[PDB]
Write a protein that binds this ligand. Structure first.
Ligand SMILES: CC1CCN(Cc2c[nH]c3ccccc23)CC1
Length: 149
């Protein structure tokens, strides 16, 4: 897989993260991110995708050593951590063909795993609209503990 880059944007209180809602195959909520172009540096791809998806420019706030990186089915995903962005910021994409909605969500209320169907004696997972965000939630809570406490 071609690696992906983007951002976990947090507010001033560190309670809330900014998620985006796509369409079709991307129909639930996730962190803003996308596929790197040939020759493009990681930090630049991250700023481009977030600006295309949210209308907010992160270039002057990115710290090159502050990110969470996951491998998901042999595709690397890296999200730069961007704290302290005010909750009254107005977010407006270019691409409204791709993004249904943008919202702040409480970190303590987001799931860190999907629920089984063990009450139905059935295998697999129940659907969850946060499916794409889920893998980052526990590593984010751990990173915020270490960095801030
Ligand atoms: C955080 C608040 C709720 C999100 N809003 C912007 C927004 C919501 N949905 C969208 C779809 C396309 C383009 C922009 C938007 C800013 C204030």
């Amino acid at each position: 897989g071609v690696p992906t880059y983007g951002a976990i944007i947090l507010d001033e209180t560190l309670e809330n993260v900014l998620l985006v809602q796509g369409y079709l195959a991307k129909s639930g909520w996730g962190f803003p991110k996308g596929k790197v172009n040939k020759e493009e540096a990681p930090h630049d791809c991250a700023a481009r995708e977030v600006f295309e998806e949210t209308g907010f420019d992160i270039k002057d706030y990115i710290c090159k050593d502050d990110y969470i990186e996951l491998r998901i089915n042999d595709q690397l995903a890296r999200l730069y951590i961007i704290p302290g962005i005010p909750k009254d910021t107005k977010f407006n994409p270019k691409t409204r063909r791709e993004i249904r909605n943008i919202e702040w969500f409480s970190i303590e209320k987001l799931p860190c795993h999907r629920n089984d169907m063990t009450p139905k004696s059935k295998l697999g997972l129940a659907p969850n609209k946060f499916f794409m965000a889920i893998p980052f939630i526990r590593p984010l809570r751990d990173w915020l503990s270490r960095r801030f406490g």
